[PDB]
Amino acid sequence: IDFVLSVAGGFVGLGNVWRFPYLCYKNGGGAFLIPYFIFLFGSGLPVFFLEIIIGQYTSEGGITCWEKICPLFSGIGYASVVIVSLLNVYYIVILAWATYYLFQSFQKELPWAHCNHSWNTPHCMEDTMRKNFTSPVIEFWERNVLSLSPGIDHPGSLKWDLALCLLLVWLVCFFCIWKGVRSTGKVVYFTATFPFAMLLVLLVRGLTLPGAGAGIKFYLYPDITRLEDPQVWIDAGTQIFFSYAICLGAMTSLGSYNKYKYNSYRDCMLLGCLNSGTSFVSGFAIFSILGFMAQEQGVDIADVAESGPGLAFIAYPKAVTMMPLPTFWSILFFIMLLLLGLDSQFVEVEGQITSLVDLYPSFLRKGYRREIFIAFVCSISYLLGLTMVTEGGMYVFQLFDYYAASGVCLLWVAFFECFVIAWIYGGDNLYDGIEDMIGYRPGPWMKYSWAVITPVLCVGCFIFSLVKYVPLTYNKTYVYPNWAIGLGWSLALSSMLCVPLVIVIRLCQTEGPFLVRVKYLLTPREPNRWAVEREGATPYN
Ligand SMILES: N=C(N)NCCS(=O)(=O)O
Ligand SMILES: N=C(N)NCCS(=O)(=O)O
Ligand SMILES: [Cl-]
């Protein structure tokens, strides 16, 4: 009765509603979809299935699973932990923004509708009378919500309204992890069907707006010359990794909770197509609104909103103003955004705690209270997130969004996950394990993706991005300083360096000749030991 689908109905998140439309709009629109679908069926679903299978087979979390499959490349798991840490720093900042918008909805007139407010510049023209001039919806996002600075080197002053909204979300996250609400009960029906109900209303509203056809044509019809830019492939390929929450140890930890004899192949395909289908369908909502905005303002569709983060805060808030009782719909939309983000944030932050606690089960569990450790992790993450709340903190958010938990850092982890399984552990060796679990031998799709398709895409994007290097920009105009780019690369290299560092550490610890050390550290350590004894299973090899 699709019980697993309802339980796993939380596949839709902020990556499908917020990040996907902004990445697609930034990369020209239709040209973004081709790499998106190439990575979807070549390295998006296969890596998701690989992580789920590793979790279900080894019956271990993010790090111990690699400790069992291949000790030498154990650092992969460590890298994932680092990645998730950075994610928890910035992924919650969006929620703060949403919370701010929520507190701005509790009034008779939505503030992003007219140009008679204090923060509005003299260049504010209402879109109705539009046909220099700036839209009131954009100015509220910039002049009021963000209070944007000239650059990242100008941090300005901390925003005391967003700081209190950021703390409010962290208190909710801390309380929902300290007590572990886990959203268990009959609220699962509401928290899984309400986002689709609101996205349907936005979709119907967006489609019926005058000029939506121009926006959809921009969204669908591709620009072939745009594909020659390497950044399109990195943005689209990593977006699959972002929405699928892979290369983080979350799916491997999730996979470990599945029974050994359980057909998780059908679930990964079902959830993968539903998660990516949600992003594609939600794209018709955003871009139909953008087509309407371009139509009335007399501007090009690519120059009517922010290319960076916040497209969902300029397009969706405007669509609300056209619905009857805009106050009612504005509240519901940002309640949906809060529900989608909080559900994802609870899983990742609590997953981060589990990985760190399991690393030191004698100290963080008995000697030092795990309850205090949850407060310590949240407190440190909150302080680091205050760098994205200052007036110049929007530029810091883009650096974290572009480099941390995205870009080459995920391609680095994805490549080594597939390389170890396909070329060291063995695709046929895993297929024998998968055959026992799911009950049948899968097709050659997974085997060829782990061995050829994924490594080629991951290493191909990395090489071509370096050969044709375009520095990160914000909203197509702002040019980051050299230190900001260097700071951004340090965020990516913080986790990328974990894979080779552990290899060096493992070799030093082991004794004997160098060749003996490598061969010893490549041998799996009983990958399915628990399976044969706790349940019914065939021992590996
Ligand atoms: N677990 C899923 N499907 N996604 C996680 C990332 S996001 O969709 O919440 O951004
Ligand atoms: N924010 C969530 N839930 N997932 C992000 C996945 S990743 O981009 O860090 O791989
Ligand atoms: Cl997506």
Swiss-Prot record:
Residues 96-159 are extracellular. It is a multi-pass membrane protein. Pfam families: SNF. Residues 506-541 are cytoplasmic. The chain crosses the membrane at residues 3-23, 31-50, 75-95, 160-178, 187-204, 240-257, 269-290, 323-342, 372-390, 407-427, 448-467, 487-505. Keywords: Cardiomyopathy, Cell membrane, Disease variant, Glycoprotein, Membrane, Neurotransmitter transport, Phosphoprotein, Symport, Transmembrane, Transmembrane helix, Transport. Expressed abundantly in placenta and skeletal muscle, at intermediate levels in heart, brain, lung, kidney and pancreas and at low levels in liver. It is found in: Cell membrane. Taurine transport activity is down-regulated upon Ser-264 phosphorylation. Taurine transport activity is stimulated by thyrotropin. Taurine transport activity is inhibited by GABA, hypotaurine and beta-alanine. GO terms for molecular function: alanine transmembrane transporter activity; amino acid transmembrane transporter activity; amino acid:sodium symporter activity; gamma-aminobutyric acid transmembrane transporter activity; gamma-aminobutyric acid:sodium:chloride symporter activity; taurine transmembrane transporter activity; taurine:sodium symporter activity. The modification Phosphoserine is found at S264. It catalyses: 4-aminobutanoate(out) + chloride(out) + 2 Na(+)(out) = 4-aminobutanoate(in) + chloride(in) + 2 Na(+)(in); taurine(out) + chloride(out) + 2 Na(+)(out) = taurine(in) + chloride(in) + 2 Na(+)(in); beta-alanine(out) + chloride(out) + 2 Na(+)(out) = beta-alanine(in) + chloride(in) + 2 Na(+)(in); hypotaurine(out) + chloride(out) + 2 Na(+)(out) = hypotaurine(in) + chloride(in) + 2 Na(+)(in). Glycans are attached at N116, N132. The keyword Glycoprotein applies. GO terms for cellular component: apical plasma membrane; basolateral plasma membrane; cell projection; dendrite; GABA-ergic synapse; membrane; microvillus membrane; neuronal cell body. One of its GO terms (biological process) is neurotransmitter transport. Belongs to the sodium:neurotransmitter symporter (SNF) (TC 2.A.22) family. SLC6A6 subfamily. It is linked to Hypotaurinemic retinal degeneration and cardiomyopathy: An autosomal recessive disorder characterized by low plasma taurine, childhood-onset progressive retinal degeneration, and cardiomyopathy. Mediates sodium- and chloride-dependent transport of taurine. Mediates transport of beta-alanine. Can also mediate transport of hypotaurine and gamma-aminobutyric acid (GABA). PANTHER family: SODIUM- AND CHLORIDE-DEPENDENT TAURINE TRANSPORTER, SODIUM/CHLORIDE DEPENDENT TRANSPORTER. This is Sodium- and chloride-dependent taurine transporter.
